[PDB]
Structure formats: C-alpha cells, structure tokens
Design a protein around this ligand. Sequence first.
Ligand SMILES: CC1(C)CCN(Cc2ccc(N3CC(=O)NC4(CCN(c5ncnc6[nH]ccc56)CC4)C3)cc2)CC1
Lengths: 241, 199
Amino acid sequence: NDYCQHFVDTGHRPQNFIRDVLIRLKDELIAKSNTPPMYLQADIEAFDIRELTPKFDVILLEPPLEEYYRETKCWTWDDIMKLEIDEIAAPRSFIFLWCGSGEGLDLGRVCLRKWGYRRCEDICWIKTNKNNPKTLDPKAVFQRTKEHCLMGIKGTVDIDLIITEEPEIGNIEKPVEIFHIIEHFCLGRRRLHLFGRDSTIRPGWLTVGPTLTNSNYNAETYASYFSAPNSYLTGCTEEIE
Amino acid sequence: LFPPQWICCDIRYLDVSILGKFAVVMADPPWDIPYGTLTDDEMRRLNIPVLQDDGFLFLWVTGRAMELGRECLNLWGYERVDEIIWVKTNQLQRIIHWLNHGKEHCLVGVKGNPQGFNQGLDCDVIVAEVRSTSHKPDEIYGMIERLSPGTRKIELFGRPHNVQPNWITLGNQLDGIHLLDPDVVARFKQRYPDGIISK
Ligand SMILES: CC1(C)CCN(Cc2ccc(N3CC(=O)NC4(CCN(c5ncnc6[nH]ccc56)CC4)C3)cc2)CC1
C-alpha cells in the first residue's frame, strides 16, 4: 500500500497509519536523582547568559520561531545565533535544539557548529492528523508535517522519532517525550531548558524563559545540588548515602 | 522518450552534458562514511550544475553526509527548501550511535525559478516497508511524478530496480547502455563514437 498516494487521495498523512505509536528501574532512578525543579523568569535577549551557573551538562533550547505562529516576540535565527551558548555549556555537554521544519534545519546546524557542537542525532517529531483529515511556506515543495530537534555533542533504548497528533492551532508545546529521550541518555544532572514555560517546569531541570510567572532560582542553592560527593552523577544511579 | 533509459558508467567520468536538462535530479550517493565509495572532494566535483536550469534536486543522506550533503547541495547551486523523511516499517506497519534510527533523510533543493510544478501535493513523510538493504522506497517516484508530471528526470547512482519511465538512470551496476531519446542518442554518439567512457 502506497500511503503517499493515499494522503493525496484522502488527506490522511502517511504517519496516521503507523501502529504502536523493563526500563522502569531507570526513570525511577532518574526520579530519585532529579534535583528539585528550578525556574527563573528572564528576558533572554536582555539577559546576560553567563549569570547562569554552573556549566550545564545538557541544554534544551526551544526558541519561539515565527513559523510556530502560522495563524497567530518571535525569535529569528539571527537572534538565536547570537546567543552565547558556549559560555554556559560544560566542556563535555549536550544540546537539544528545536529547529522547526524550514530554514532552521540549516541555520540550526550553523548554530551548533558556532557553539562548538557536532550533531550526532536528528530527532523527528512526526505529527499525525487523525483528528482532522496546510498553508505552505512559499519555498515549500511539500506539505510539512514534522519538526526536527537536533542533538549536538561537544567533547569526548529510544528511537530518533516522536509521533503524536498535531496540537491545536497556536499550541506551541513540544512533546514531553523529548524529556524522556534526554533523561534516558543519562548525560548528567545540570539540565537547562531555555525558553521553557510554566507548563514545562519539571524535576531535574532548570527552566529559564520570559513568560515564567514566578522564579525560585538561586545560583548558590542550585550549585549546592551538585557539590561533592555528587559532582559527576549521570542522573541514572542511586543517591550517595 | 517516455520508457526507461540507463547508462552503465562511472558518474565520476561520464560527460553528463550530453544528457541535456532535467526537471528533477535524484541522487543516493555512496558517501564515504561495502561497495564503491566516493570521496568528499569527488562528491564536491560532480558536475551536477550542468544537469538543470530550473528544477528540483532530491539528495539522500545519512550520518555525517547530513552536513556534507548540505554542503554539496549548496556548492552545486541549490537551496534546501524541504527535507523528506522515510519512516521504515515492517509489513505490519510497526517501526523497525546514541539512538536507533527509524528513518532516512532525503534533502530537497531548488535551482532557478521552476514553474508549473504541483507543490504541496504530498507531505514530507514517507511510511513504507523495507525491501533490500540500501534500497530507497518506491514511493519517492510517485511523489516526484505528482510534483512534476511528464518531465525529464535523471537518477544518479541508481541500480537496476531503480529504472523508471521518464527517468534516465546512471550507475555502474547497470546493464550496458539503453537510450531511446533521439537528442541524447545523437549527443552520445558524437561524444563517444566507440561506446567507451574513460578519463
Ligand atoms: C534510502 C537510503 C537508506 C539512503 C542512503 N543510501 C545510502 C546508500 C547505500 C548503497 C549505495 N550503493 C550501493 C551499490 O552497490 N551501488 C550504488 C549504485 C551505483 N554506484 C556507482 N554508479 C556510478 N559511478 C560510481 N562510482 C563509484 C560508485 C559508482 C555505486 C553505488 C548504490 C548508495 C547509497 C541508501 C538508501
């Protein structure tokens, strides 16, 4: 069966027909290891990034692209590229960068290289439209039904796919599954989410964004969660007695 | 000449100017990253730019070719305007370094000002079953035909199964030279009076 012809025939995206779309000790170990959620309201354009310490093992970066507002402050790749991400990234660390589906797939790679990372994975968020069987970008050749989250590394169980139904128009949330994929990597405990929201706050993570309504961040308190004997934990091991 | 055509050769050495212009180019290169590979400089030197004036390039990538392929695409004079992913399923529609790979990427580039194409008919995801190893899904051709119906199309680094109507297929594992378009057959004989392609 040719699901592209079928999409052309009926408006159902090919991904609608993927079916099916224990690691339980992990997740629990993660949950025991997670620092208390920390969060801080900050206008990141106007905010000295270096003020965020210590250096992060993982950076999830979710800047609000104009394309996320089809029928609705947008950040350009010009703006994003100017962020000093290398200044707060640990010598060995990881970045997860949401790039959309347009020019971001190229400009995002430029950012990763600019900040010092090499891409080692391209995670695709494939959106099903089972509940509503698209106004295209001018340069678009096809209907766009996915978003890419690029994984970069710097220094020395899961699939590279996330399948969910397309969120309602103007819902910019990204699938919470991205967090599961990151946590299951066991990359370390200092985890930063730039351009998060009240809705994305989460144990194990420090969230910085302009729309957060409350803050609780304190550098020294944050730092205390990683002082010895806890400096190098993966996030996937037991707490040290 | 609508029916399949093909040319066993080394694309490194074939004088691709004899082939004329195409509305769509597709390549699935043997990126140097089990068979005859090409080096990055060889990939960069491929004479893609002569093959088109206005049209689309489809370029399969994997691993680090994800970046290298973007470099070649740009070097050859295209802008990447889309990226297709093929989700690999079994016959029962379940999914097959740091993550297991459930997909393959195909970059889409545009050159010039193509007109009369049916942009927006399909979507950038393919869901289809794996056949043999290193075999791209047949659905790409139906996608490419709906995008640009009836036009001349060339595939680079194809294999026997890849031969299609409206397509000329170039590859080194193909069976001789089979050409039916008169304009091509002419320019071939002129450039290659003895049926051998060398330097
Ligand atoms: C959808 C995918 C998973 C995406 C990624 N890709 C990776 C891939 C795997 C294998 C191969 N190749 C296997 C093979 O055996 N032959 C060729 C075809 C003819 N060919 C040449 N043709 C003319 N000149 C030449 N110079 C030197 C070689 C050469 C050598 C290569 C194809 C190409 C690409 C697969 C699908």
